[PDB]
Amino acid sequence: GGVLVN
Amino acid sequence: GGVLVN
Amino acid sequence: GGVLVN
Amino acid sequence: GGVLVN
Amino acid sequence: GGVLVN
Amino acid sequence: GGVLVN
Numbered sequence: 001g002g003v004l005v006n
Numbered sequence: 007g008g009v010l011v012n
Numbered sequence: 013g014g015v016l017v018n
Numbered sequence: 019g020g021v022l023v024n
Numbered sequence: 025g026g027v028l029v030n
Numbered sequence: 031g032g033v034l035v036n
């Protein structure tokens with residue numbers, strides 16, 4: 001899956 | 007905010 | 013699954 | 019914000 | 025923000 | 031998956 005740390 | 011379409 | 017830390 | 023389309 | 029189309 | 035650190 002994707003990981004987005006905004 | 008962030009947008010994650012997995 | 014995806015991980016979003018906003 | 020960031021956009022991630024995985 | 026960044027845009028990542030994976 | 032992709033990793034976006036924004």
Ligand SMILES: [Zn+2]
Pocket residue numbers: 001002003031032
């Ligand atoms: Zn993953």
Ligand SMILES: [Zn+2]
Pocket residue numbers: 007008009019020
């Ligand atoms: Zn936003």
Ligand SMILES: [Zn+2]
Pocket residue numbers: 001002013014015
């Ligand atoms: Zn996952």
Ligand SMILES: [Zn+2]
Pocket residue numbers: 019020021025026
């Ligand atoms: Zn943005």
Ligand SMILES: [Zn+2]
Pocket residue numbers: 025026027
């Ligand atoms: Zn931008």
Ligand SMILES: [Zn+2]
Pocket residue numbers: 031032033
């Ligand atoms: Zn990966």
